[PDB]
Ligand binder design. Structure first.
Ligand code: HEM
Ligand code: HEM
Ligand SMILES: [Cl-]
Ligand SMILES: [Cl-]
Ligand SMILES: [Cl-]
Ligand SMILES: [Cl-]
Ligand code: NA
Ligand code: NA
Ligand code: NA
Ligand code: NA
Lengths: 262, 262, 262, 262
């Protein structure tokens, strides 16, 4: 009998972003000092870039196959995704495919992503507020940038908008590929006549979306579009994994997944 | 090769509520006149009550086992649930368990519940508005009553609240067992100082929640709580399956499930 | 928590053959007096004939769906098949598909068919010898008639021939659709110059194969072919479920399946 | 769309035995020159020994996870096992677990082991006879040594004995762990009063069973036991993968698995 933890993030190949994952690994090690911790990454393109730089970057299937070969029997897989979308559901199916294979893993549990229950959504809204930069003034809007998805779990972003507005009417959620859109966010900002607007990534790590879509020099970036509208944009290039308050939520979800192994 | 459709609702055992399901069956027959239509029900307690009244009320597993015995090969299962919650996920697992069984069904697809994508959520908000009673005046709040759930898909109800408010700030979502709660709804109503409030079930059929929790004579009902606060409550005891605009959404989801059989 | 037993035979629709299944049901009830016993049938054509006569004849899927609806949680499914062939493997897949379905069965185990391990094969050979008619004389060959199959488990019939010959060189195995063939059996009989030959069904119930292929009046029957060769054929129209010694083997396999539920 | 072949043997870590696998790899490459060929090994202890010598030795799960990462979509897994026993069934379950995983393999087929149908068993018996050493004289018994297993597929060894005896009454099958036992084989040899007896491995590669259990210097080896009985034992230390006639059977099974990918 041998318990392991498999941490699974979307993944990033940009070195300014990656230390935020190491931080998460330290938090997990601190909370479960006697349980081995392994990593896998869900984006196929990011694993390709990391392998290109000479770095091991297993898929969840490669990771679990390797853990089965090490003699692990019970593994808690923790998603560092934001929503239970396509990536999370793929992960769940992969994890459960390994469970019970002859001579392999006995039990493979999967921790919920950040926005799990409506109780999580409420805790996430509170944690995001606690994570705001000290320089943001009352009344200055903050736009949280999510990936967005065609998957049904896209509904987590407007759900989160509901909980954020219970706390502060000037906190907004926008996404690159889903709803609410950035056009919807600009319409929110126009009615508020906001002159300074903060932009913060909703995702665990500030990867390419945070750096280019949110804050790039190109015309199409959120910060470029806002500057054209006469708004002072203040991008914050740290993902939510940096915040202790946000990270506590993924940790609780891992505690729940570990309890499900018994 | 033989295609069938299996319609699956939560189910109701109250006779004033049931004709709304028959209506849905007529709509499906009208749209797919050459495809046989069968019914199953997801609530174990409702199947028990219906069997007690001498009425056949198969579970999804009983229904699919019987369809396999009739020689169906390809079956589109359409959920008449509101959200992709515990009932919907149980249905998906059951459906897929039958698919590919030796000598049984070849392919079993499953249509999304009402609030599927964020695009569905937006269409549902529009359809609910189109479904409002003609006597409701501008500015009179309307509270839509959902079941609510501990499942992660509970987040669909605050998500829907986001889309409803894009249309009319006085449309509210409350749930019996989840979030937003009825206490949250009363806090919304208090700030609006509303004197007349309409109550409409969000679920396909106005069963026991609509009739007792929403509109019962008991002190704990929504209409009783509102009357104690001096509000004229106007309960509407028809489920969303009665509305053509809402029903079109389940129909489109069935069309999508039928296309997935090829 | 509620344990049940599901007995699954190929099935027969001939009334002279069926009482042999009832016998098996009595044996099971006698051995497990406190555990409810249900029946299902694996041949689709036999279920069709039985339903035509007004008799309930559920498939394994219909039976397990109905047991889940009765509130059973742990079910031992016992195969009354002879070999782990196509029917047995279909049964195993169906059984395991039900296990773990949301709100349904917790655990569904499956008892091995008659010729399970090589230890079973040896016990079957001994039981068949104990079951021979008292009138068969030493040296008179006995041909055991199996169904035969294109499935890999067809190899059980020549395997059984090996164990039978360890007991008596004049015991032979033939099959209708597999190997050894009836032509192979006649070649065995020709070298023995046997003048009287007994024919016994290997299958649980003497259905249509026993009655027509083995012993029919038509030219193609085994008894007709033997009579053309000048051999006195002595067909025995009772299946192996009639023998206490053979039936004990299925009972032990059911005991093993019941132990697997804990 | 990208087809691959995964060859899976029990595996051997002895260097005198391994070239027989390379031979099989050449045969496969010759028959399917445009399809990439990968290897995996089913015995956990052999993968451990090979990794200890600095040699990559993936499990079937590690291999398929790696192939999915290379962008293969359709993979024919060919078992180089002798019987559809525990190893083969584990392989089938693992293979099918990978099939259909989100973003991974589309289709994973599995080729039958050597003794697949009774038609294979008959072809194997013919191929084994064709593979006998030219120095073996008519009437000298040959004992084929199988692993043996507690799994139900152990019945393949007495099944094969049936087909071998149709060809030559002095060809015998024995196993290390199943039936027929080596004691059963010595009883066969005693009745034949054989003075010289050949011993040949039934398995693909002459690993540790062939070299130690069959032909070791220790008292318990088959050759040592025979020498104590006054029999000249002639061990042949080549597995069946060396024979072209035996290898053709695995090749046909691979052709069948490749056809199942369409
Ligand atoms: C907002 C929350 C959720 C939504 C909207 C949702 C929606 C869906 C949808 C649309 C599918 C169909 C497959 C797909 O398109 O991905 C699905 C499948 C599935 N979901 Fe969820 N899901 C949610 C949360 C969860 C969570 C947290 C779990 C983990 C317990 C879960 C367990 C599953 C499983 C096991 C399936 C496979 C169904 C099958 O057996 O065929 N879902 N879900
Ligand atoms: C002589 C004995 C047996 C033979 C020759 C045999 C052979 C096979 C074959 C050829 C298959 C592929 C599917 C098919 O064509 O049916 C298979 C699948 C399977 N067998 Fe057996 N089998 C035997 C006994 C058993 C028994 C007694 C069990 C019950 C534990 C079993 C468990 C399974 C399972 C679970 C599969 C599905 C594989 C998958 O996951 O894809 N087998 N077997
Ligand atoms: Cl700060
Ligand atoms: Cl009206
Ligand atoms: Cl008698
Ligand atoms: Cl030679
Ligand atoms: Na996100
Ligand atoms: Na609802
Ligand atoms: Na039979
Ligand atoms: Na072997």
């Amino acid at each position: 009998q041998k318990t392991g933890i498999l941490l699974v993030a979307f993944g990033t190949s940009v070195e300014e972003a990656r230390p935020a994952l190491d931080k998460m690994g330290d938090r997990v090690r601190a909370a479960h000092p006697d349980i081995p911790v392994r990593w896998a990454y869900t984006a196929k393109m990011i694993r390709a870039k990391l392998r290109a730089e000479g770095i091991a970057a297993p898929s969840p299937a490669e990771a679990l196959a390797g853990m089965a070969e090490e003699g692990f029997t019970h593994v808690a897989v923790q998603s560092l995704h934001t929503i239970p979308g396509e990536e999370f559901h793929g992960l769940l199916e992969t994890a459960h495919a390994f469970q019970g294979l002859p001579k392999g893993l006995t039990r493979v549990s999967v921790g919920l992503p950040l926005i799990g229950t409506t109780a999580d959504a409420e805790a996430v809204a509170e944690a995001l507020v606690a994570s705001l930069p000290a320089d943001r003034k009352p009344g200055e809007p903050v736009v949280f940038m999510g990936h967005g998805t065609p998957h049904p779990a896209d509904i987590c972003y407007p759900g989160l908008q509901y909980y954020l507005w219970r706390l502060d009417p000037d906190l907004l959620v926008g996404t690159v590929e889903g709803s609410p859109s950035f056009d919807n966010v600009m319409a929110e900002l126009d009615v508020r006549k906001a002159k300074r607007v903060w932009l913060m990534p909703l995702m665990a790590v500030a990867g390419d979306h945070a750096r280019n879509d949110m804050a790039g020099d190109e015309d199409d970036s959120w910060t470029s579009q806002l500057a054209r509208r006469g708004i002072e944009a203040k991008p914050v290039l740290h993902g939510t994994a940096e915040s202790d308050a946000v990270a506590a939520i993924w940790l609780r979800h891992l505690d729940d997944a570990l309890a499900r192994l018994n």
